């Protein structure tokens, strides 16, 4: 039949993927090779000339990694993908195709912070200006748009408080101005939101979190119309930042994508659960998780994603120290920096990645000397609530 | 004892490794992590500071890719590694962490094309202007000098006839100009080229070729000294280009290197005798080889090489329609555009790669019609001149 | 803490491993090694005189697989476990190690092809004797024991009709005659049943099915007391099967067994459905499923098994000709052998697998001409059913 | 062609390998899969009744391990190959498919030390019955013979002091009285040694060593007769032993063997240096290594061996104390027990594996006190000799 046709599950497991044609082989193959060999001249002209179906080296294009861009695409309901060495370089891979010299994007304050790096600083030293804004209000987005603006550029959920952004309210500004809408749906993954259904001309996604989920490998994807993605493949990757990712890393991420339905599910299950835990305690000032009522965006969360997600950001009373403390109790949850994997993981900025960052600077960019961050993973949510609750009540 | 003291042979096989600390293990383990866990917040803090020892992500950095970057930087005697997606981040990784807008390139118009491709095109869109010049030539390149100059950039062997750059001279007007000197080296290896002995400052390999030698890796190094390459990972690689490699790629590259002293050494012993069988033949108009005397730089092929290479150019009697013929006509080489493979690839660009560009372009480009490209393996020779005597006499 | 004293879905994500000792790496390291190096003539000693715990060589033991053993042991509720490269090496290298020529052993008849092929064919060969028995009939086991009985073997639940053997029964029916009880736990995984705790001495596990889980893996795994797997290590792996599992396949098997929890509910979630479609269904004659409470021994399956599993057999009306048409007609359930994979695979043993055996001789065995095994996947159950109705109609 | 024509360097890049027939994939893509999916119910049963060539589970057969196996087949001259999970299972599943209880085999003595054990302590256990003989004495092999005897095996270059046996001879004498001859070519690599050549019916390898090369797989493999590697396959493996090869060991085993060539060379051609060093030196009493004319079987040697190997072992002046000091003092080669590896590892059997035996039962071995075991590596011979000899002055 046709890929797009079955159940979000049955897309997962299947879309992309099929038999080996020459083995039957269940598994895609691991097509773990630089190049690809041609049976005459003719063959290696027809290909180059993209007259003609086939493969010809691995930076350009791989069955494995094919494969993942497949599914993916499927799963977002756009028509190409176009896997990456990185989420990082999805997202520039992306922007730097977009945009040259004398362009201009507006991007959302709150966003992963090395995309903020290159946004910040990168971006203009190649003529490419940014002006950014607080995206959960469109107004904002609107009044900064120029006519030099190529694209917005927008998280959502946003780090650190899980802030949102209305995609829909988003896209409609940004294509009344001419602009393309480019979405990181790494916190969600296809399975909780599609940007592209809601409009959004990009989407963007770390594999590194929750579509691998396994903690194993550093990856990204573009999904997009097959125009955009042939340029940011014949040109962004081929040419720009030579960004590919290994048919290993490929063949990982389809065998993690597998599961993405059962453990997003999971993961979502789990946080809920967690989130009432932490929005029961009285050494917890606030909780920041789109599935408690209280979220400022909750009805905005409920129309847009499928799931609140598996991401808890909370304040834990004391500041610093009494942050410090807790992490420094946990005995379960593993203290360290990604999200999205099988493991819980948590970090606390303040005291870990932004120690040395003045504290009314980090007050700015919404990180307070108490807040935590917690990527909930597969365990008994009974286990992760006793750890959590043992770290709280020594560190208060 | 150091890493630096022992023989070259030695040092491709043990420097930038040794046995796993917690278990003994002699193979470097493939630590395909995306994440690393902290023992404490201040473990974690110390480590973001650049202040303690460590690892915290794997598009940072990665013990395994760590142990593949140190064995580059011994081996090209250069203080520092940095390990890339391939070949084309690691030009690009390295160029967009030195240039930005306003800033300038003199480069040889003799080199690989995607890199011609970004340098052409892509560069001048973020407002870095290109200079191409003939590098054979090193007056050309003193007189395209700018005060705006950052980089020269040179590859050597070049392709697609082999022609040479004289590092040493080229340096010597770079530096004097107040620019750094940037040498591709995938062609040679640092088996046998080492461009920063020569006063090169940066040297970068697609380990696609020789380094890894197995065709079944794509993959970048950047060496040079510690404060550049910390700035091309924490700024070119971390935000710009994300082309970080995939441990099992480095894993991969780091068995691969093990045995690029014997794989070179027989590489150029094949080539040799293939060469010498090429020029004997009379239906074969030019031969390109390092390792003729009739090369019109032969002299300083011999200073600058340890060995002449394992790439032959040659020129086919009878044209397009010849070279078309022959190549469809080996049995034993592989038609393929990659080289240092253990198998020997064969390429005939005016009808596989550049078919629909014009014929005075490419001749222009140095590529005429009967032009063969061939990266001898480690058959045996005899068997490969038998191939090609085969596909020659038949294809004229 | 301790590994053992967590939840059971917190035990499948941590048990058996932890961050990496010399780096944090989460990712339990590939460790892709053959040999293992020692820092002193006295460490080498001291190791191989197992007077000190690390390592020495990966056939007979590696960190990695070591992880894997760890954790099945917990999730088993066993002392230790022995990794093997597949599940036959896993029943061979157990029956190899307990027994020897003069021995006896009792087997239930209704097992695994391959390993009725060892107990019928190759053990009397060894002058070790094999009594096959109804073991759903536990006097029948009591009946077989001889003076020499060394071992009794069973499935639970067992092809091809998904019958169950009353484990604590056979277990004190062993003990009592002095003979070791052997649970072949494949079919179940350790998330759905666990027989040592109902006073099996020894599990094994084919890998290959759900405790990896994703179809990409062969192996197995032994479970039992740390006396017996020494020997089946430093004996039987070491010197007669020689079956050790690489340590890339360990890895992969702890990657896929993160997931075993979420995989295994949605496993038994899907097949509950499927199963009552079956039983609805007036073109399908019999269905044979734990679930059914017209399951011959649906009392013991729900006291034995937390869930019904995953496998489904039926028989479609109108014999071979219908089975072959049937399986002929799916078009999203994959005609294939194996079981326990994210994708639903289906087969039809009398057409595919026993065409040529005796009519006479299947039926026997159990396997009526219209008899179809299915393995549900991960798919949405909607669309598994609507295929199955879809190729069901048509067949018949 | 065909792969059996070419030169053997040609032979060990090509033999048993070829494009991916779907995508032209130079490296063998690497089918890391458990099971194969039918096209139909008669292609099953095709497949199942060996009618139809094709995969169906890779317990039984896989496309990444079948090119291992034919390549391997092409180097031995020997009609097909069949991976195993380690050596010590390639030796086991040829013996214990050869022979039943009741069966008798002649053995050498001076064989692979776990070899010894399963022929010692587990054949017997089955009713199969082992004659050790010194097989350096063709005689002793002839006097052992029984109306019972199945199978001679023997081993050459031998462990500990590299005697050897001769082949052809013993061949003959094993024919004539009705059993077949087995070699372990382990040490040599058929790039060295082609006992089928030379009479033997069946070649068994560790691939761990030589034949990989980089010291990162365990494997083994065994040539021979179709008829006889067809049983091997079909009840040996299937059923016995369980001891497949995963497709990612044979990969990397394939990816190691393209160079066998040129390691061999550099492996013998620093051995030759260091062995004739260790032969001048006052403080070595002996000097086990076939390439000194000193070596008792020498004539032997240069006739049956192509090269005379990578493996030396020395008798250092001063017994157990010296070995010891002398192990404790290296600081480049490395303290391990395996060999075939790209860096250089030593061992002192009396001090580091056999410590706690009997000294008069070591010597009753050929294992002095002062035996050291080296395997040489590819490092410059030079930095080796060096090292050595520092040691050696050291420890003396
Ligand atoms: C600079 C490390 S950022 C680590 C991870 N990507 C995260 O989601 O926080
Ligand atoms: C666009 C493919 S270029 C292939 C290979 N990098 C070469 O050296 O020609
Ligand atoms: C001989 C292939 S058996 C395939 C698979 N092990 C099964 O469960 O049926
Ligand atoms: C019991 C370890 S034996 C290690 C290696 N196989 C050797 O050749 O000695």
């Known amino acids: 039949s046709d890929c797009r046709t079955y159940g979000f599950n049955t897309q997962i ?17 691991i097509f773990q090779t630089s190049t690809f060999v041609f049976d005459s001249a003719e063959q290696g002209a027809a290909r180059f000339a993209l007259e003609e179906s086939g493969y010809i080296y691995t930076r350009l294009g791989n069955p494995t990694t094919d494969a993942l861009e497949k599914k993916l695409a499927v799963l977002e309901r756009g028509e190409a993908g176009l896997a990456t060495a990185s989420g990082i370089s999805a997202i520039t891979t992306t922007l730097l195709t977009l945009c040259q010299q004398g362009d201009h994007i507006v991007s959302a304050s709150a966003i992963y912070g090395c995309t903020h790096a290159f946004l910040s600083h990168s971006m203009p030293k190649f003529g490419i200006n940014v002006s950014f804004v607080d995206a959960a209000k469109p107004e904002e987005i609107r009044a900064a748009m120029r006519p030099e603006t190529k694209v917005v550029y927008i998280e959502t959920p946003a780090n650190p408080t899980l802030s949102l952004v209305d995609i829909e309210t988003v896209a409609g500004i940004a294509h ?20 592209l259904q809601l409009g959004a001309d990009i989407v963007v996604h770390s594999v590194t979190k929750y579509i691998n989920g396994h903690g194993d490998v550093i990856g990204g994807i573009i999904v997009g119309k097959q125009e955009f993605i042939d340029q940011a493949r014949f040109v962004g990757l081929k040419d720009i930042t030579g960004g590919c990712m290994s048919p290993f890393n490929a063949w ?4 993690g994508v597998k599961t993405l339905g059962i453990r997003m599910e999971r993961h979502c299950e789990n946080a809920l659960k967690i989130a009432r835990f932490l929005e029961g305690h009285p ?28 991401i808890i950001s909370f304040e834990i009373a004391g500041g610093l120290e009494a942050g410090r403390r807790m992490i420094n109790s946990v ?11 099988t493991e819980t993981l948590i970090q606390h900025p303040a005291s870990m990645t932004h120690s040395p960052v003045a504290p009314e600077e980090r007050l700015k960019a919404g990180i307070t000397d108490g807040l935590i961050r917690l990527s909930v993973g597969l365990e008994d949510p009974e286990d992760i ?4 609750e043992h770290a709280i009540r020594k560190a208060t």
């Open 176 to 195: 009344q101005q001419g602009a393309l809408l480019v979405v990181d749906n790494t916190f969600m993954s296809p399975y909780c939101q599609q940007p």
């Open 283 to 310: 050494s917890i000032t606030r909780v920041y998780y789109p599935g408690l009522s209280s979220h400022p965006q909750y009805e905005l969360g409920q129309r847009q994603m499928s799931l609140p997600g598996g």
């Open 331 to 341: 005995e379960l949850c593993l203290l360290a920096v990604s999200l999205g994997d």
């Open 13 to 29: 497991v299947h879309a992309g993927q099929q038999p080996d044609p020459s083995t039957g082989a269940l598994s895609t193959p």
């Open 252 to 255: 990982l991420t389809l065998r």
């Open 385 to 388: 609530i006793n750890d959590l």
